[PDB]
Each structure stands twice: as C-alpha cells, then as structure tokens.
C-alpha cells in the first residue's frame, strides 16, 4: 500500500452518509454492522493490527488470544522454527516428525505436548470505546459509504421505495469503487517493490523463508565476484 493507515473514529462515515436525505435513518448501530461486513468482504490485511503473543501448550492444545482473527505464523518459542498446517487426522490420539498446528475456535491444536509457541496474529484496531476504528483513506471511506448506501437501497428496493434505476446506479458505483479500493490497499509501495524484487531475482533460489518468519524474504541476494 502506498498510503498510510491513519485511523479515525467510525462516525466519520456517518458524517458523509447522512448528506444523503434518504440515509437519515442510519445509526452508529447500523454503521458498526455494515462496517464489519465491509471489512471482512474486502479482506484487506493492511486494515488489521499485527500482534505477537506467546501461549503455553498443555497437551497438544493451547488457549488462543481473545482478539485473534487470523494467524500469520506460529513458531516454537525456544527454537524459532515455524509450524505448518496439520494434515494428520489422528494428531494426539495414540495407537496400542516436524511440528504443525490447527486452530478452530479459542483453541490451537499443535502436534507438541508441552512447549511455548509464539503466534503472530491480526486483530482489529479498536477505539477508546470498544468499537472498530476505520482508515481515513477517502477511497476506503467512499467505498464503505457506497457499500452502506447499496445495502440500504437494496432494502428500500425490496419494499419498492426506490427506483430500479437508482439501485442499478448505486450497484455500478459501488462495484467500481470496490475494485479501486482493492487495488489501493494491495498494490505495493516502492519499499514493498524492493522487497518483492529481492524476492524475485535470485541466481540461487531461496525456498525456506517459511522456517524463519519470512524475515529474509525481501533480502537481496549477493553473489561474490570471482
């Protein structure tokens, strides 16, 4: 992403929506739900807060943080070796290898009995109130505005309180701004293209940056001169 994620409070979107006379029954309560829906539907990883938090494994099981949404990595605390996805169907079940993990709810199922594991996860940036905090990018703001307007107009169209042409226009505009917002947050910046370039050109390919925390992924590959 080229631009920086400067955070602003949620009613910034209600400042802009309520300019429309047909959206004056919208509320913070509705904006919260539709904002969370938009955040998930776009799935942008720059909108989440990166956190690292250690936990203990009692026996092939560990308690997971409260605010976790998605895991970047899990690794062993003492070695630093990363874990992979668990493909085993009988992990801690005995009868009569490398470490891996599997997470469903508040519980992470590892293949290790008693160790500390480090989890690098993504959460939502919250407010002084326990509420979501949105980027102030006017592209993001316009796209979220258009998302909420599209949902409200879809309800009102299901009633027959909006013309089909009005909803068709709203859907067209939301679709274009959704694509544009997707490209805004995903296209790398200059530093991210230097990292991608140093990942791309290897005379000797590097294929083991998962073992580390992808630390050396964008490190330049130097060849000595002979």
């Amino acid at each position: 992403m080229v631009n920086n994620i400067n955070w602003v409070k949620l009613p910034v979107i209600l400042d802009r929506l309520l300019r429309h006379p047909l959206l004056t029954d919208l509320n913070l309560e509705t904006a919260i739900q539709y904002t969370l829906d938009f955040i998930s539907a776009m799935g942008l990883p720059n909108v989440y807060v990166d956190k690292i938090e250690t936990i203990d494994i009692k026996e092939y099981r560990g308690e997971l943080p409260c605010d976790l949404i998605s895991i970047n990595q899990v690794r062993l605390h003492k070695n630093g070796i990363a874990l992979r996805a668990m493909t085993d169907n009988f992990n801690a079940y005995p009868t009569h290898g490398e470490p891996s993990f599997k997470t469903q709810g508040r519980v992470i199922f590892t293949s290790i009995k008693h160790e500390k594991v480090d989890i690098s996860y993504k959460a939502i940036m919250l407010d002084d109130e326990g509420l979501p905090l949105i980027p102030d990018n006017p592209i993001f703001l316009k796209t979220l505005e258009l998302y909420i307007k599209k949902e409200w107009f879809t309800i009102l169209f299901d009633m027959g309180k909006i013309s089909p042409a009005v909803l068709n226009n709203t859907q067209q505009e939301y679709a274009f701004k959704a694509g544009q917002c997707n490209n805004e947050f995903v296209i790398p910046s200059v530093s991210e293209m230097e990292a991608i370039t140093n990942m791309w050109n290897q005379l000797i390919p590097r294929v083991t940056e998962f073992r580390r925390g992808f630390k050396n992924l964008g490190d330049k590959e130097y060849i000595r001169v002979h």
């Binding site: 027959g160 013309s163 089909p164 042409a165 068709n168 226009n169």
Partner: peptide
C-alpha cells in the same frame, strides 16, 4: 353528501401506479 377518504386514496394509488410505470421506463 360527500367524503374523500376512499376517493383520495384511490386517486393517489392511480398516480402512484403511473409513477412507477414512468420510473420503470427510466434507463441509464
């Protein structure tokens, strides 16, 4: 005698129906 309750609402409904036809002919 007179009373415009049913008359007014039927006229309003007629106007709403040609309203919907007119807007349903609108295309971007």
């Amino acid at each position: 005698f007179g009373s415009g309750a049913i008359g007014y609402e039927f006229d309003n409904r007629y106007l709403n129906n040609q309203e919907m036809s007119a807007v349903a002919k609108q295309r971007l």
